[PDB]
PDB file of C-alpha atoms and ligand atoms in Angstrom:
ATOM      1  CA  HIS A   1    -191.000  72.335 -34.907  1.00 48.92           C
ATOM      2  CA  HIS A   2    -187.867  70.285 -35.644  1.00 50.76           C
ATOM      3  CA  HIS A   3    -186.751  71.990 -38.847  1.00 54.53           C
ATOM      4  CA  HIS A   4    -184.193  74.546 -37.667  1.00 53.76           C
ATOM      5  CA  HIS A   5    -181.220  74.691 -35.304  1.00 53.07           C
ATOM      6  CA  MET A   6    -181.420  78.469 -34.759  1.00 55.00           C
ATOM      7  CA  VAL A   7    -184.063  81.166 -34.919  1.00 54.35           C
ATOM      8  CA  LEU A   8    -182.121  82.793 -37.791  1.00 56.05           C
ATOM      9  CA  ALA A   9    -181.392  79.480 -39.562  1.00 57.61           C
ATOM     10  CA  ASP A  10    -182.269  80.795 -43.058  1.00 58.82           C
ATOM     11  CA  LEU A  11    -179.932  83.757 -42.615  1.00 61.28           C
ATOM     12  CA  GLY A  12    -177.247  81.497 -41.153  1.00 61.32           C
ATOM     13  CA  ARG A  13    -177.488  78.991 -43.977  1.00 58.12           C
ATOM     14  CA  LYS A  14    -176.864  81.784 -46.526  1.00 61.84           C
ATOM     15  CA  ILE A  15    -173.900  83.185 -44.606  1.00 61.89           C
ATOM     16  CA  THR A  16    -172.211  79.837 -44.033  1.00 59.11           C
ATOM     17  CA  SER A  17    -172.667  79.052 -47.731  1.00 59.74           C
ATOM     18  CA  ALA A  18    -170.961  82.328 -48.662  1.00 60.77           C
ATOM     19  CA  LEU A  19    -168.132  81.611 -46.225  1.00 63.25           C
ATOM     20  CA  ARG A  20    -167.710  78.004 -47.382  1.00 62.98           C
ATOM     21  CA  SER A  21    -167.356  79.176 -50.996  1.00 62.95           C
ATOM     22  CA  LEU A  22    -164.666  81.620 -49.957  1.00 64.52           C
ATOM     23  CA  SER A  23    -162.779  79.074 -47.893  1.00 63.93           C
ATOM     24  CA  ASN A  24    -162.821  76.711 -50.906  1.00 62.58           C
ATOM     25  CA  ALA A  25    -161.664  79.268 -53.521  1.00 59.83           C
ATOM     26  CA  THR A  26    -158.429  78.046 -55.067  1.00 61.29           C
ATOM     27  CA  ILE A  27    -156.883  81.511 -54.676  1.00 62.38           C
ATOM     28  CA  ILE A  28    -158.026  84.224 -52.271  1.00 59.82           C
ATOM     29  CA  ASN A  29    -158.180  87.607 -54.053  1.00 58.14           C
ATOM     30  CA  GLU A  30    -160.257  90.774 -53.890  1.00 57.93           C
ATOM     31  CA  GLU A  31    -162.725  89.377 -56.430  1.00 56.60           C
ATOM     32  CA  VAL A  32    -163.290  86.285 -54.266  1.00 56.21           C
ATOM     33  CA  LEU A  33    -163.624  88.449 -51.146  1.00 58.07           C
ATOM     34  CA  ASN A  34    -166.113  90.835 -52.801  1.00 56.55           C
ATOM     35  CA  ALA A  35    -168.192  87.917 -54.096  1.00 52.93           C
ATOM     36  CA  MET A  36    -168.450  86.713 -50.487  1.00 52.98           C
ATOM     37  CA  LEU A  37    -169.397  90.134 -49.112  1.00 50.28           C
ATOM     38  CA  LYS A  38    -172.050  90.435 -51.834  1.00 51.05           C
ATOM     39  CA  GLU A  39    -173.642  87.161 -50.746  1.00 50.06           C
ATOM     40  CA  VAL A  40    -173.434  88.175 -47.075  1.00 48.05           C
ATOM     41  CA  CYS A  41    -174.874  91.655 -47.624  1.00 49.12           C
ATOM     42  CA  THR A  42    -177.693  90.204 -49.740  1.00 49.86           C
ATOM     43  CA  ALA A  43    -178.520  87.614 -47.061  1.00 50.80           C
ATOM     44  CA  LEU A  44    -178.708  90.358 -44.424  1.00 51.20           C
ATOM     45  CA  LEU A  45    -181.008  92.476 -46.619  1.00 52.53           C
ATOM     46  CA  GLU A  46    -183.184  89.380 -47.135  1.00 52.08           C
ATOM     47  CA  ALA A  47    -183.351  89.197 -43.306  1.00 52.22           C
ATOM     48  CA  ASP A  48    -184.746  92.790 -43.286  1.00 51.50           C
ATOM     49  CA  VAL A  49    -181.582  94.351 -41.894  1.00 52.06           C
ATOM     50  CA  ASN A  50    -181.512  98.015 -42.834  1.00 53.76           C
ATOM     51  CA  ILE A  51    -179.384  98.955 -45.858  1.00 56.09           C
ATOM     52  CA  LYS A  52    -177.412 101.515 -43.818  1.00 56.92           C
ATOM     53  CA  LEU A  53    -176.363  98.829 -41.326  1.00 55.95           C
ATOM     54  CA  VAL A  54    -175.537  96.353 -44.115  1.00 54.60           C
ATOM     55  CA  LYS A  55    -173.435  98.998 -45.876  1.00 56.10           C
ATOM     56  CA  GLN A  56    -171.585  99.722 -42.620  1.00 56.94           C
ATOM     57  CA  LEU A  57    -170.879  96.029 -42.007  1.00 60.60           C
ATOM     58  CA  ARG A  58    -169.325  95.652 -45.458  1.00 59.57           C
ATOM     59  CA  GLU A  59    -167.135  98.730 -44.917  1.00 53.60           C
ATOM     60  CA  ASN A  60    -165.969  97.294 -41.604  1.00 55.92           C
ATOM     61  CA  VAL A  61    -165.046  93.889 -43.035  1.00 53.76           C
ATOM     62  CA  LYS A  62    -163.138  95.507 -45.909  1.00 50.41           C
ATOM     63  CA  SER A  63    -161.405  97.828 -43.450  1.00 46.49           C
ATOM     64  CA  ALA A  64    -160.366  94.927 -41.204  1.00 44.77           C
ATOM     65  CA  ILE A  65    -158.974  92.776 -44.027  1.00 44.83           C
ATOM     66  CA  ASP A  66    -155.726  93.768 -45.735  1.00 46.35           C
ATOM     67  CA  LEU A  67    -155.021  91.164 -48.413  1.00 45.46           C
ATOM     68  CA  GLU A  68    -152.182  92.813 -50.360  1.00 41.69           C
ATOM     69  CA  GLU A  69    -149.522  92.850 -47.634  1.00 41.53           C
ATOM     70  CA  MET A  70    -150.431  90.564 -44.782  1.00 39.53           C
ATOM     71  CA  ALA A  71    -149.068  89.298 -41.498  1.00 40.99           C
ATOM     72  CA  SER A  72    -146.860  86.272 -41.641  1.00 45.73           C
ATOM     73  CA  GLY A  73    -148.447  83.269 -39.994  1.00 42.83           C
ATOM     74  CA  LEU A  74    -152.122  83.976 -40.580  1.00 40.22           C
ATOM     75  CA  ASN A  75    -154.537  81.723 -42.426  1.00 39.25           C
ATOM     76  CA  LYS A  76    -156.153  84.420 -44.526  1.00 40.90           C
ATOM     77  CA  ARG A  77    -159.370  82.562 -45.340  1.00 41.90           C
ATOM     78  CA  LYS A  78    -159.801  82.043 -41.588  1.00 41.20           C
ATOM     79  CA  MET A  79    -159.016  85.686 -40.856  1.00 40.28           C
ATOM     80  CA  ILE A  80    -161.717  86.734 -43.339  1.00 37.28           C
ATOM     81  CA  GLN A  81    -164.272  84.435 -41.710  1.00 36.14           C
ATOM     82  CA  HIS A  82    -163.357  85.812 -38.273  1.00 35.39           C
ATOM     83  CA  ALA A  83    -163.758  89.366 -39.600  1.00 36.25           C
ATOM     84  CA  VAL A  84    -167.247  88.507 -40.804  1.00 35.55           C
ATOM     85  CA  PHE A  85    -168.155  86.735 -37.541  1.00 33.56           C
ATOM     86  CA  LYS A  86    -166.948  89.708 -35.504  1.00 36.29           C
ATOM     87  CA  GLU A  87    -168.961  92.144 -37.601  1.00 34.47           C
ATOM     88  CA  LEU A  88    -172.091  90.007 -37.263  1.00 37.97           C
ATOM     89  CA  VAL A  89    -171.726  90.148 -33.471  1.00 38.74           C
ATOM     90  CA  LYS A  90    -171.433  93.956 -33.583  1.00 37.87           C
ATOM     91  CA  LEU A  91    -174.511  94.158 -35.791  1.00 36.88           C
ATOM     92  CA  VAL A  92    -176.772  92.664 -33.068  1.00 35.23           C
ATOM     93  CA  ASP A  93    -174.830  94.159 -30.172  1.00 35.66           C
ATOM     94  CA  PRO A  94    -175.878  97.456 -28.500  1.00 34.30           C
ATOM     95  CA  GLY A  95    -172.322  98.413 -27.556  1.00 31.28           C
ATOM     96  CA  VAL A  96    -173.664  99.019 -24.069  1.00 30.30           C
ATOM     97  CA  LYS A  97    -173.883  96.977 -20.866  1.00 27.97           C
ATOM     98  CA  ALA A  98    -177.393  96.149 -19.725  1.00 25.14           C
ATOM     99  CA  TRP A  99    -178.623  96.910 -16.207  1.00 25.06           C
ATOM    100  CA  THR A 100    -178.566  93.967 -13.794  1.00 23.50           C
ATOM    101  CA  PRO A 101    -180.122  93.608 -10.335  1.00 21.42           C
ATOM    102  CA  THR A 102    -177.783  93.960  -7.373  1.00 19.79           C
ATOM    103  CA  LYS A 103    -177.695  91.162  -4.786  1.00 19.85           C
ATOM    104  CA  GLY A 104    -178.459  92.362  -1.291  1.00 19.73           C
ATOM    105  CA  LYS A 105    -180.372  95.327  -2.739  1.00 19.67           C
ATOM    106  CA  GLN A 106    -184.082  95.613  -3.525  1.00 17.88           C
ATOM    107  CA  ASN A 107    -184.578  95.928  -7.290  1.00 13.84           C
ATOM    108  CA  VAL A 108    -187.773  97.289  -8.866  1.00 12.20           C
ATOM    109  CA  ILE A 109    -188.391  96.287 -12.507  1.00 14.65           C
ATOM    110  CA  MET A 110    -191.288  97.799 -14.437  1.00  9.48           C
ATOM    111  CA  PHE A 111    -192.604  96.344 -17.707  1.00  8.18           C
ATOM    112  CA  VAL A 112    -194.184  98.256 -20.597  1.00  5.66           C
ATOM    113  CA  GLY A 113    -195.388  97.114 -23.996  1.00  6.49           C
ATOM    114  CA  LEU A 114    -197.947  97.635 -26.704  1.00  9.29           C
ATOM    115  CA  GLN A 115    -200.804  95.237 -27.393  1.00 10.93           C
ATOM    116  CA  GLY A 116    -199.556  92.019 -28.943  1.00 10.25           C
ATOM    117  CA  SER A 117    -196.094  92.430 -27.412  1.00 11.62           C
ATOM    118  CA  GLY A 118    -196.438  89.441 -25.086  1.00 11.45           C
ATOM    119  CA  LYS A 119    -195.638  91.753 -22.148  1.00 10.64           C
ATOM    120  CA  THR A 120    -197.613  89.938 -19.453  1.00 11.06           C
ATOM    121  CA  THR A 121    -196.294  86.391 -20.143  1.00 14.87           C
ATOM    122  CA  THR A 122    -192.804  87.913 -20.291  1.00 13.52           C
ATOM    123  CA  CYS A 123    -193.332  89.234 -16.725  1.00 14.38           C
ATOM    124  CA  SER A 124    -193.901  85.799 -15.207  1.00 18.10           C
ATOM    125  CA  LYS A 125    -190.988  84.457 -17.277  1.00 17.03           C
ATOM    126  CA  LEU A 126    -188.591  87.039 -15.886  1.00 15.92           C
ATOM    127  CA  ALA A 127    -189.876  86.292 -12.379  1.00 15.46           C
ATOM    128  CA  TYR A 128    -189.407  82.539 -12.861  1.00 15.78           C
ATOM    129  CA  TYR A 129    -185.891  83.176 -14.154  1.00 12.09           C
ATOM    130  CA  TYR A 130    -184.911  85.126 -11.025  1.00 11.03           C
ATOM    131  CA  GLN A 131    -186.798  82.818  -8.661  1.00 10.01           C
ATOM    132  CA  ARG A 132    -184.884  79.892 -10.147  1.00  6.59           C
ATOM    133  CA  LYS A 133    -181.586  81.703  -9.593  1.00  6.83           C
ATOM    134  CA  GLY A 134    -182.346  81.966  -5.872  1.00  7.56           C
ATOM    135  CA  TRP A 135    -183.688  85.517  -5.693  1.00  7.09           C
ATOM    136  CA  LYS A 136    -186.746  86.307  -3.603  1.00  6.88           C
ATOM    137  CA  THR A 137    -189.044  87.582  -6.336  1.00  8.45           C
ATOM    138  CA  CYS A 138    -192.622  88.812  -6.689  1.00 11.25           C
ATOM    139  CA  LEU A 139    -195.112  90.142  -9.233  1.00  8.38           C
ATOM    140  CA  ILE A 140    -197.422  93.157  -9.079  1.00 10.59           C
ATOM    141  CA  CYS A 141    -200.274  93.755 -11.510  1.00  9.34           C
ATOM    142  CA  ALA A 142    -200.707  97.530 -11.677  1.00 10.77           C
ATOM    143  CA  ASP A 143    -203.990  97.211 -13.535  1.00 11.94           C
ATOM    144  CA  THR A 144    -207.679  96.614 -12.899  1.00 13.37           C
ATOM    145  CA  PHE A 145    -208.841  93.143 -11.837  1.00 12.18           C
ATOM    146  CA  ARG A 146    -211.284  93.345 -14.774  1.00 11.63           C
ATOM    147  CA  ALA A 147    -208.391  93.231 -17.272  1.00  8.38           C
ATOM    148  CA  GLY A 148    -207.705  89.868 -18.904  1.00 10.66           C
ATOM    149  CA  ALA A 149    -203.991  90.269 -18.145  1.00  9.09           C
ATOM    150  CA  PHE A 150    -204.829  90.434 -14.414  1.00  9.80           C
ATOM    151  CA  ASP A 151    -206.107  86.860 -14.258  1.00 11.78           C
ATOM    152  CA  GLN A 152    -203.365  85.882 -16.709  1.00  9.88           C
ATOM    153  CA  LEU A 153    -200.529  87.136 -14.507  1.00 10.57           C
ATOM    154  CA  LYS A 154    -202.226  85.810 -11.353  1.00 12.95           C
ATOM    155  CA  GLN A 155    -202.774  82.298 -12.693  1.00 12.66           C
ATOM    156  CA  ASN A 156    -199.227  82.251 -14.114  1.00 14.60           C
ATOM    157  CA  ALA A 157    -197.867  83.364 -10.710  1.00 13.88           C
ATOM    158  CA  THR A 158    -199.900  80.705  -8.897  1.00 14.11           C
ATOM    159  CA  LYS A 159    -198.609  77.851 -11.063  1.00 17.27           C
ATOM    160  CA  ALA A 160    -195.026  79.030 -10.590  1.00 14.09           C
ATOM    161  CA  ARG A 161    -195.560  79.711  -6.840  1.00 15.73           C
ATOM    162  CA  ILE A 162    -194.471  83.324  -7.298  1.00 17.74           C
ATOM    163  CA  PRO A 163    -196.046  85.834  -4.851  1.00 18.67           C
ATOM    164  CA  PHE A 164    -198.582  88.077  -6.612  1.00 17.93           C
ATOM    165  CA  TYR A 165    -200.111  91.432  -5.655  1.00 16.36           C
ATOM    166  CA  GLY A 166    -203.202  92.870  -7.306  1.00 17.05           C
ATOM    167  CA  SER A 167    -206.208  94.851  -6.117  1.00 19.15           C
ATOM    168  CA  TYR A 168    -209.790  93.582  -6.057  1.00 18.74           C
ATOM    169  CA  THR A 169    -211.216  97.124  -5.629  1.00 15.91           C
ATOM    170  CA  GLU A 170    -208.745  99.889  -6.459  1.00 16.64           C
ATOM    171  CA  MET A 171    -209.322 101.585  -9.778  1.00 11.72           C
ATOM    172  CA  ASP A 172    -206.117 103.621  -9.950  1.00 15.27           C
ATOM    173  CA  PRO A 173    -203.124 101.683 -11.383  1.00 14.65           C
ATOM    174  CA  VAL A 174    -200.604 104.202  -9.967  1.00 13.41           C
ATOM    175  CA  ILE A 175    -201.920 103.669  -6.418  1.00 14.31           C
ATOM    176  CA  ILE A 176    -201.956  99.888  -6.998  1.00 17.49           C
ATOM    177  CA  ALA A 177    -198.302  99.899  -8.068  1.00 15.20           C
ATOM    178  CA  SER A 178    -197.244 102.160  -5.193  1.00 16.89           C
ATOM    179  CA  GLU A 179    -199.051  99.982  -2.665  1.00 21.23           C
ATOM    180  CA  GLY A 180    -197.700  96.804  -4.252  1.00 24.04           C
ATOM    181  CA  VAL A 181    -194.073  97.957  -4.216  1.00 24.02           C
ATOM    182  CA  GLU A 182    -194.431  99.197  -0.632  1.00 20.39           C
ATOM    183  CA  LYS A 183    -195.760  95.861   0.577  1.00 21.20           C
ATOM    184  CA  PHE A 184    -193.058  93.796  -1.127  1.00 20.48           C
ATOM    185  CA  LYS A 185    -190.226  96.097  -0.057  1.00 20.31           C
ATOM    186  CA  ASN A 186    -191.541  95.797   3.485  1.00 19.42           C
ATOM    187  CA  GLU A 187    -191.437  91.995   3.126  1.00 20.11           C
ATOM    188  CA  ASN A 188    -187.758  92.112   2.061  1.00 20.33           C
ATOM    189  CA  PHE A 189    -188.175  91.002  -1.578  1.00 19.70           C
ATOM    190  CA  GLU A 190    -185.136  91.310  -3.850  1.00 20.77           C
ATOM    191  CA  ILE A 191    -186.799  91.315  -7.287  1.00 19.67           C
ATOM    192  CA  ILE A 192    -190.075  93.244  -7.566  1.00 22.03           C
ATOM    193  CA  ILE A 193    -191.605  93.099 -11.057  1.00 17.87           C
ATOM    194  CA  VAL A 194    -194.408  95.478 -12.024  1.00 20.83           C
ATOM    195  CA  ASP A 195    -196.701  94.785 -14.995  1.00 21.10           C
ATOM    196  CA  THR A 196    -198.579  97.774 -16.423  1.00 20.67           C
ATOM    197  CA  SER A 197    -201.512  97.853 -18.822  1.00 19.97           C
ATOM    198  CA  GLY A 198    -200.730  96.444 -22.250  1.00 21.28           C
ATOM    199  CA  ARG A 199    -203.912  97.779 -23.897  1.00 26.49           C
ATOM    200  CA  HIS A 200    -202.175 100.504 -25.868  1.00 26.73           C
ATOM    201  CA  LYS A 201    -201.914 100.668 -29.634  1.00 26.32           C
ATOM    202  CA  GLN A 202    -200.082 104.027 -29.807  1.00 27.07           C
ATOM    203  CA  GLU A 203    -196.817 105.126 -28.223  1.00 27.17           C
ATOM    204  CA  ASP A 204    -198.489 108.336 -26.985  1.00 25.51           C
ATOM    205  CA  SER A 205    -200.867 106.708 -24.504  1.00 25.82           C
ATOM    206  CA  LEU A 206    -198.333 103.986 -23.646  1.00 26.76           C
ATOM    207  CA  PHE A 207    -195.552 106.370 -22.644  1.00 25.42           C
ATOM    208  CA  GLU A 208    -198.016 108.621 -20.803  1.00 27.63           C
ATOM    209  CA  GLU A 209    -199.091 105.863 -18.426  1.00 28.46           C
ATOM    210  CA  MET A 210    -195.465 104.697 -18.318  1.00 29.40           C
ATOM    211  CA  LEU A 211    -194.209 107.921 -16.806  1.00 34.54           C
ATOM    212  CA  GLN A 212    -197.116 108.095 -14.327  1.00 31.68           C
ATOM    213  CA  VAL A 213    -196.263 104.686 -12.908  1.00 28.88           C
ATOM    214  CA  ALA A 214    -192.503 105.286 -13.171  1.00 28.82           C
ATOM    215  CA  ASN A 215    -192.693 108.501 -11.138  1.00 31.76           C
ATOM    216  CA  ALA A 216    -194.751 106.812  -8.425  1.00 33.10           C
ATOM    217  CA  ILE A 217    -192.532 103.749  -7.943  1.00 34.84           C
ATOM    218  CA  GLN A 218    -189.046 104.947  -9.003  1.00 40.94           C
ATOM    219  CA  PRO A 219    -188.106 101.760 -10.895  1.00 42.10           C
ATOM    220  CA  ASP A 220    -184.491 100.678 -11.175  1.00 42.82           C
ATOM    221  CA  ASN A 221    -185.022  99.488 -14.760  1.00 44.84           C
ATOM    222  CA  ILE A 222    -187.822  99.643 -17.320  1.00 47.13           C
ATOM    223  CA  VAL A 223    -188.182  96.781 -19.781  1.00 51.77           C
ATOM    224  CA  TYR A 224    -189.909  97.450 -23.103  1.00 50.77           C
ATOM    225  CA  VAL A 225    -191.370  94.265 -24.570  1.00 48.82           C
ATOM    226  CA  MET A 226    -191.426  94.242 -28.404  1.00 48.66           C
ATOM    227  CA  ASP A 227    -192.898  91.993 -31.089  1.00 50.00           C
ATOM    228  CA  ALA A 228    -189.896  91.385 -33.355  1.00 45.30           C
ATOM    229  CA  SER A 229    -191.981  90.329 -36.332  1.00 45.87           C
ATOM    230  CA  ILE A 230    -191.958  93.953 -37.558  1.00 45.87           C
ATOM    231  CA  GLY A 231    -188.290  93.597 -38.444  1.00 43.98           C
ATOM    232  CA  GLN A 232    -186.328  96.815 -38.929  1.00 43.66           C
ATOM    233  CA  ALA A 233    -189.320  99.022 -38.012  1.00 43.48           C
ATOM    234  CA  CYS A 234    -188.271  98.010 -34.491  1.00 42.87           C
ATOM    235  CA  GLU A 235    -185.674 100.786 -34.678  1.00 40.51           C
ATOM    236  CA  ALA A 236    -188.071 103.726 -34.462  1.00 39.24           C
ATOM    237  CA  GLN A 237    -190.015 101.895 -31.786  1.00 36.68           C
ATOM    238  CA  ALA A 238    -186.921 101.251 -29.674  1.00 33.61           C
ATOM    239  CA  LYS A 239    -185.563 104.767 -30.173  1.00 35.36           C
ATOM    240  CA  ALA A 240    -188.743 106.403 -28.864  1.00 35.32           C
ATOM    241  CA  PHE A 241    -188.653 104.217 -25.765  1.00 33.13           C
ATOM    242  CA  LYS A 242    -184.938 104.800 -25.178  1.00 34.34           C
ATOM    243  CA  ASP A 243    -185.347 108.584 -25.452  1.00 34.55           C
ATOM    244  CA  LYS A 244    -187.925 108.511 -22.649  1.00 33.11           C
ATOM    245  CA  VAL A 245    -186.196 106.510 -19.907  1.00 32.72           C
ATOM    246  CA  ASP A 246    -182.782 106.472 -18.253  1.00 33.07           C
ATOM    247  CA  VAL A 247    -182.258 102.743 -17.573  1.00 33.73           C
ATOM    248  CA  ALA A 248    -183.786 101.060 -20.621  1.00 31.32           C
ATOM    249  CA  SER A 249    -183.909  97.399 -21.535  1.00 29.48           C
ATOM    250  CA  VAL A 250    -185.745  95.457 -24.214  1.00 27.02           C
ATOM    251  CA  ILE A 251    -187.144  91.947 -24.408  1.00 28.49           C
ATOM    252  CA  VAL A 252    -188.020  90.734 -27.874  1.00 26.32           C
ATOM    253  CA  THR A 253    -190.792  88.233 -28.592  1.00 23.10           C
ATOM    254  CA  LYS A 254    -192.091  86.646 -31.796  1.00 23.09           C
ATOM    255  CA  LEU A 255    -188.557  86.311 -33.142  1.00 21.37           C
ATOM    256  CA  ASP A 256    -189.510  83.077 -34.917  1.00 18.83           C
ATOM    257  CA  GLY A 257    -191.926  82.219 -37.690  1.00 19.51           C
ATOM    258  CA  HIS A 258    -190.835  84.904 -40.170  1.00 18.01           C
ATOM    259  CA  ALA A 259    -187.650  85.932 -41.935  1.00 22.29           C
ATOM    260  CA  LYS A 260    -187.170  89.297 -40.220  1.00 20.67           C
ATOM    261  CA  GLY A 261    -185.519  88.445 -36.884  1.00 22.08           C
ATOM    262  CA  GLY A 262    -182.083  89.721 -37.923  1.00 16.92           C
ATOM    263  CA  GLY A 263    -183.613  93.029 -38.987  1.00 17.31           C
ATOM    264  CA  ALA A 264    -185.377  93.402 -35.639  1.00 17.60           C
ATOM    265  CA  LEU A 265    -182.281  92.537 -33.588  1.00 18.46           C
ATOM    266  CA  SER A 266    -180.011  94.870 -35.520  1.00 16.51           C
ATOM    267  CA  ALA A 267    -182.559  97.729 -35.474  1.00 18.76           C
ATOM    268  CA  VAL A 268    -182.789  97.658 -31.655  1.00 16.16           C
ATOM    269  CA  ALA A 269    -179.009  97.370 -31.299  1.00 19.24           C
ATOM    270  CA  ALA A 270    -178.680 100.364 -33.639  1.00 21.87           C
ATOM    271  CA  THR A 271    -180.465 102.466 -31.028  1.00 19.75           C
ATOM    272  CA  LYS A 272    -177.985 101.202 -28.398  1.00 18.13           C
ATOM    273  CA  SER A 273    -180.844  99.647 -26.423  1.00 18.02           C
ATOM    274  CA  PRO A 274    -179.720  96.244 -25.027  1.00 15.50           C
ATOM    275  CA  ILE A 275    -181.961  93.255 -25.603  1.00 12.46           C
ATOM    276  CA  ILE A 276    -181.639  91.294 -22.329  1.00 12.85           C
ATOM    277  CA  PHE A 277    -183.840  88.268 -23.090  1.00 14.02           C
ATOM    278  CA  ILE A 278    -185.829  86.651 -25.905  1.00 14.17           C
ATOM    279  CA  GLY A 279    -189.289  85.214 -25.273  1.00 15.25           C
ATOM    280  CA  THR A 280    -189.523  81.960 -27.232  1.00 14.68           C
ATOM    281  CA  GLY A 281    -192.954  80.478 -26.594  1.00 14.51           C
ATOM    282  CA  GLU A 282    -196.043  79.970 -24.478  1.00 11.19           C
ATOM    283  CA  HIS A 283    -194.433  78.205 -21.487  1.00 10.88           C
ATOM    284  CA  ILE A 284    -192.835  79.924 -18.549  1.00 12.90           C
ATOM    285  CA  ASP A 285    -189.381  78.456 -19.263  1.00 14.38           C
ATOM    286  CA  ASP A 286    -189.593  79.478 -22.958  1.00 21.07           C
ATOM    287  CA  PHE A 287    -187.178  82.274 -22.254  1.00 21.13           C
ATOM    288  CA  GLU A 288    -183.498  82.857 -22.659  1.00 22.39           C
ATOM    289  CA  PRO A 289    -180.929  85.576 -21.977  1.00 18.72           C
ATOM    290  CA  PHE A 290    -179.533  87.252 -25.072  1.00 18.24           C
ATOM    291  CA  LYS A 291    -175.750  86.953 -25.410  1.00 15.19           C
ATOM    292  CA  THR A 292    -174.566  88.183 -28.764  1.00 17.00           C
ATOM    293  CA  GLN A 293    -171.299  86.248 -29.199  1.00 18.17           C
ATOM    294  CA  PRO A 294    -172.815  82.832 -28.249  1.00 18.34           C
ATOM    295  CA  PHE A 295    -175.938  83.710 -30.275  1.00 16.81           C
ATOM    296  CA  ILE A 296    -173.905  84.289 -33.466  1.00 16.83           C
ATOM    297  CA  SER A 297    -171.602  81.355 -32.548  1.00 18.01           C
ATOM    298  CA  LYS A 298    -174.529  78.939 -32.451  1.00 17.35           C
ATOM    299  CA  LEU A 299    -175.911  80.319 -35.714  1.00 19.99           C
ATOM    300  CA  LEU A 300    -172.787  79.783 -37.820  1.00 21.14           C
ATOM    301  CA  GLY A 301    -171.782  76.545 -36.102  1.00 20.98           C
TER     302      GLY A 301
HETATM  303 MG1   MG B   1    -173.555  97.544 -32.922  1.00 23.21          MG
END
């Protein structure tokens, strides 16, 4: 796994090629600019970005660039590249600030996801992240001890030395969560992370159980964990989540190993749901916060 410098390397290679050709054109004119936008738009469609979002990006770049009469002192090939960079950041950016825990407060974070989302590993990763930043953090499994994800979260918590709460008798996941959050609030924890059952294929049953547990524990933030390998079909998925909760965040997994990561990122951003982290592998530190400007910076660098 040495081949690429960025998860969107194939998209980035096509965009930097387009931009290099424009910066090397002997004269910069509308034909040269349009040739570049064509290559950029095509690369984004080949990354499974939705046509509507690709058409809007092109509009925006053409609206930002005024070739005919232009500012004295500007390098106009550089201005065009900055216009494209800026519009690529917008394309993966929700336009909205994500919720963050407050220091000195108790913060309850509830996870939801469909089967195959990587929800449960993502829980321990978020806990490790906050534990490493000096927060007193804990995990609750609001699920039956017979579920595979119960042992999974417990063994992950043990290795990381993160306090874990599950029940070895209680059948009702709502009661489990309530009891778990009560215990950890009483023990002065700052970050309290609640994993729910991931054994849902349909949104219907997933969002049903989601509201049951939400109402019981009053979470400060709900994180939807999504498999990004479905590309732009992430939009409908993210919209339905966002319409059902007030304080909504998304963590994307499976962003690698396929060509559709740009589509997935831009679909979620199109719903104005902020992706807060990316899960990048099997290990507990395979995890990174999602910052759009540095993300696009590293891609085109
Ligand atoms: Mg945007």
